[PDB]
Design a protein around this ligand. Structure first.
Ligand code: NA
Ligand code: NA
Length: 209
DNA sequence: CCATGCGCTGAC
DNA sequence: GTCAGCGCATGG
């Protein structure tokens, strides 16, 4: 797959799991190994990860409200920090807004024919609330295609403006956290994937003090 | 070129 | 738990 492919990655079913983000990147399902969103600001967003990293994220499984990135001071060669400035409808935030089936709008937009929007591959990471109903117990899990129904700017918990996006699921395969999804995962033999040599290295490191 | 970054690791 | 700061891919 080209980097700008929209839609599912062939041969990677819903429910596939990987221990580390770099493995998710290698699969093609989410090519950035740090960033939450993969997008091109004049094309759209191809995928996103829910990893508990923004306090304004709210995950309801078949739908969720995702937060834009940025509004943060990453001075000192940081990757994450708390909010310290307003977010902007630029870069990955603009990309994800362009998936919505409505022209880009600096005040937000909502699509009526929201399935006509561009698909987003969604991965859930283990981090987030304790004993989440949706997050995997370990690693990262591909949960299928979702679509951006609407997006809008709002005052975040921090008091700074954040961009927010409502995504709804649009995938024919069962959600992995449901009974049907757990049955499909069992039948397909989907299990956590680890880097070559990792479990051996772990086994060696566990031999002594 | 330079900016961005929902990770990761392990010393403390 | 807290924390600091690293390579790297990606793209503006
Ligand atoms: Na990245
Ligand atoms: Na980029």
């Amino acid at each position: 797959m080209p980097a700008n492919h929209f839609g599912p990655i062939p041969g990677v079913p819903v429910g596939t799991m990987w221990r580390f983000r770099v493995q998710v990147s290698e699969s093609g399902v989410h090519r950035p190994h740090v960033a939450g969103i993969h997008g091109r600001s004049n094309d759209g967003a191809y995928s996103l990860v829910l990893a508990g990293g923004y306090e304004d994220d709210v995950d309801n499984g078949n739908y969720f409200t995702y937060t834009g990135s940025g509004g943060r001071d990453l001075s000192g060669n940081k990757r994450t920090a708390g909010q310290s400035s307003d977010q902007k409808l630029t870069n990955n935030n603009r990309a994800l807004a362009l998936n919505c089936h409505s022209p880009i709008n600096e005040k937000g937009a909502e699509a009526e024919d929201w399935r006509q929007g561009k698909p987003v591959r969604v991965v859930r990471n283990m981090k987030g609330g304790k004993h989440s109903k949706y997050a995997p117990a370990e690693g990262n899990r591909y949960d299928g295609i979702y679509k951006v129904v609407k997006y809008w700017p709002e005052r975040g918990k921090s008091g700074f403006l954040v961009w927010r996006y409502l995504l709804r699921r649009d995938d024919t395969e069962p959600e992995p956290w449901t009974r049907e999804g757990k049955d499909r995962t069992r039948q397909l033999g989907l299990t956590m994937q680890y880097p070559e040599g990792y479990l051996e290295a772990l086994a060696n490191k566990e031999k002594s003090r």
